[PDB]
Design an enzyme around this catalytic site. Structure first.
Site, PDB file in Angstrom:
ATOM      1  N   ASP A   1      14.736  81.545  63.444  1.00 36.79           N
ATOM      2  CA  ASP A   1      13.778  82.349  64.200  1.00 36.79           C
ATOM      3  C   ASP A   1      12.497  81.567  64.459  1.00 36.79           C
ATOM      4  OD1 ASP A   1      13.023  84.649  65.597  1.00 36.79           O
ATOM      5  OD2 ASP A   1      12.228  85.662  63.800  1.00 36.79           O
TER       6      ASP A   1
ATOM      7  N   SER B   1      10.066  95.293  58.386  1.00 42.78           N
ATOM      8  CA  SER B   1       9.009  95.439  57.393  1.00 42.78           C
ATOM      9  C   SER B   1       7.641  95.768  57.986  1.00 42.78           C
ATOM     10  CB  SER B   1       8.909  94.159  56.565  1.00 42.78           C
ATOM     11  OG  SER B   1       8.464  93.067  57.358  1.00 42.78           O
TER      12      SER B   1
END
Length: 327
Positions: free
Chosen positions: A154, A49
């Protein structure tokens, strides 16, 4: 083959959910109004993104817009559903809206704005107390997510937004996050190299929430020892070797033996034989003020090869390291 594994906590939270809670594929996105938002500055671009500072002229508040690249077509509903499931949780970034970007023709996620200070410049100044304070805040987010059947996958400094002025923290970028289902095999290609748990590095797929506690530990080590990153691999193979030079090879073999895992044979020539090290060897005059017996014990209980033996997020919050933190 490999022995199966289950989380020791929050094991069945999703099985007792309506299909709709975790069935993100069937989720029907509620679309907002893209013209509510005006892009102001491009902040960055990840793999999945582009991220913009924007303004919400409907109320005039500042927001963050993540315009999703034509991604893995379905990471989209997964991230949206997870964000909606976790919304309002402690230190969880708030999804404010979901709109269709007219140029990209992809979904654009609209978030609450957070006034962050670059972790590099930020960690060079954090005091002992502030390390503890912010770690505790991260744990609130992780335990909340885990209690809701979700792992982040993450955890790293770039995904922790800190407004130091207001002593406010948010755990962001849930694009790799997943629903935990006991017995489910997962992609080991998650997290960033320096924060990847041993389970990922030995290709063990039946992992769980405890993956993020390794990542948190690797973060903590870099902070209290002033070493970035703490485990500095050249690649994913060298990364495991860097870990083994600290935790030792005997406990590594105990680990893969327990789960009947076979190391990639390419480790035969590079892994060597290494003793477990005492954490004191990483202490020096420049980082000693950040170290305490409590810090070292806490770190020691996060950085375990065996994912089942690591502190859970809640157990971590119980640790003496945080006794000094005002609650």
């Amino acid at each position: 083959g490999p022995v199966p594994s289950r989380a020791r906590v929050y094991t069945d939270v999703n099985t007792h959910r309506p299909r709709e809670y975790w069935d993100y594929e069937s989720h029907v996105v509620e679309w907002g109004n893209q013209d509510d938002y005006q892009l102001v500055r491009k902040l960055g671009r990840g793999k999945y993104s582009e991220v913009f500072e924007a303004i919400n002229i409907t109320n005039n508040e500042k927001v963050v817009v993540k315009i999703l690249k034509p991604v893995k077509k379905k990471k989209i509903k997964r991230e949206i559903k997870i964000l909606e499931n976790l919304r309002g949780g402690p230190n969880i970034i708030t999804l404010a809206d979901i709109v269709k970007d007219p140029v990209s023709r992809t979904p654009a996620l609209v978030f609450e704005h957070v006034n962050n200070t670059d972790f590099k410049q930020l960690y060079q100044t954090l005091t002992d107390y502030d390390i503890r304070f912010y770690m505790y805040e991260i744990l609130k987010a992780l335990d909340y997510a885990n209690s809701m059947g979700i792992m982040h996958r993450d955890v790293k400094p770039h995904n922790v937004m800190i407004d130091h002025e207001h002593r406010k923290l948010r755990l962001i970028d849930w694009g790799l996050a997943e629903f935990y289902h006991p017995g489910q095999e997962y992609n080991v290609r998650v997290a960033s190299r320096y924060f990847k748990g041993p389970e990922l590095l030995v290709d063990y797929q039946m992992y769980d929430y405890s993956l993020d506690m390794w990542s948190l530990g690797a973060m903590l080590a870099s902070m209290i020892f002033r070493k970035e990153p703490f485990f500095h691999g050249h690649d994913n193979y060298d990364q495991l070797v860097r870990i083994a030079k600290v935790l030792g090879t005997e406990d590594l073999y105990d680990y893969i033996d327990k789960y009947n895992i076979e190391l990639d044979p390419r480790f035969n020539d590079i892994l060597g034989r290494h003793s477990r090290k005492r954490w004191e060897r990483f202490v020096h005059s420049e980082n000693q003020h950040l170290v305490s017996p409590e810090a070292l014990d806490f770190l020691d209980k996060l950085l375990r090869y065996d994912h089942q033996s690591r502190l859970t997020a809640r157990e971590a919050m119980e640790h003496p390291y945080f006794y000094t933190v005002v609650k």
